[PDB]
Design a protein around this ligand. Structure first.
Ligand SMILES: O=C(O)[C@H]1O[C@@H](O[C@H]2[C@H](O)[C@H](O)[C@H](O[C@H]3[C@H](O)[C@H](O)[C@H](O[C@H]4[C@H](O)[C@H](O)[C@H](O)O[C@@H]4C(=O)O)O[C@@H]3C(=O)O)O[C@@H]2C(=O)O)[C@@H](O)[C@@H](O)[C@@H]1O
Ligand SMILES: [Ca+2]
Length: 244
């Protein structure tokens, strides 16, 4: 199944292992799954971040191919373990790819792809927050654009707290800035901007849903010496439009 909508609550599973076959049946498809790091914990999907490791080497980086569209939304709950080691930060949650789906230091300067995802980050002074990681035509650096936004805008996020995250994306047309990127967390708008995802219209469509949970960053101080856990629940995905 290449779905256009999904509603997953993991409520039908016994506490225990969660295979990529399980992931395929809930998501329709889920590529790049690493089932030794997925686990059902009390009606909840738990993802393990391995100690002394970053990116795919320690986390779970899955893409769910979806029905191509020009407008999409999703909702989900995310909770860090009550004893989570924040460390420097990393990627969390469900987002969207457009076109070639640029990530990982490959900026969308060529007008052929981008992504809408979210990170956590801890500053030198110890403030911890969520922040956008947006790859798009006009991203200023090789890595994701934050638009300078953070949730909360003052203070820090908190371990053990359930954050309800709403993500909405809209394709742009041609070379116009008439696309949209939007992230709302517990009712607060973190990001809501016009954006130019692409300049090549053959790559303007939303093509899959990202499910990326990892530490880093690529420097070793983003690592943690303990295995760490992030809990997801209530994923609702909905195609809104396809406008060729
Ligand atoms: O604040 C600091 O300490 C330093 O930050 C340095 O920049 C960071 C960025 O802030 C982001 O954290 C960025 O994340 C990258 C990763 O480095 C890595 O590419 C990760 O890659 C994945 C990827 O998502 C892809 O989907 C693939 O499937 O797996 C990849 C993999 O195996 O590598 O992707 C993140 C991303 O997509 O943005 O990392 C940089 C960095 O430098 O590593 C920098 O600003 C530094 O000066 C600061 O001191
Ligand atoms: Ca549940």
């Amino acid at each position: 199944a290449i779905p256009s909508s999904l509603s997953i609550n993991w409520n039908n599973y016994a506490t225990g292992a969660y295979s990529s076959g399980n992931a395929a049946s809930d998501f329709g498809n889920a590529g790049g799954w690493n089932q030794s790091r997925s686990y059902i914990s009390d009606g909840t999907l738990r993802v393990t971040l391995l100690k002394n490791a970053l990116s795919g080497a320690g986390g779970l980086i899955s893409n769910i191919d979806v029905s191509d569209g020009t407008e999409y939304e999703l909702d989900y709950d995310v909770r860090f373990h009550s004893q989570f080691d924040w460390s420097r930060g990393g990627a969390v949650g469900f987002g969207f790819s457009i076109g070639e789906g640029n990530t990982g230091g490959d900026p969308g300067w060529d007008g052929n792809g981008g992504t809408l995802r979210m990170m956590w980050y801890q500053t030198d002074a110890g403030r911890v927050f969520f922040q956008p990681a947006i790859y798009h035509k006009d991203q200023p650096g090789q890595y994701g654009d934050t638009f300078g936004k953070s949730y909360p805008s003052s203070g820090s996020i908190t371990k053990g707290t359930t954050y309800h995250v709403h993500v909405y994306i809209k394709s742009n047309t041609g070379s116009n800035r008439d696309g949209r990127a939007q992230i709302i967390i517990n009712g607060t708008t973190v990001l809501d901007t016009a954006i130019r995802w692409t300049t090549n219209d053959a790559q303007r469509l939303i093509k899959n849903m990202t499910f990326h949970t990892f530490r880093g960053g690529s420097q070793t101080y983003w690592q943690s010496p303990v295995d760490s856990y992030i809990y997801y629940d209530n994923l609702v995905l909905r195609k809104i439009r396809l406008e060729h």
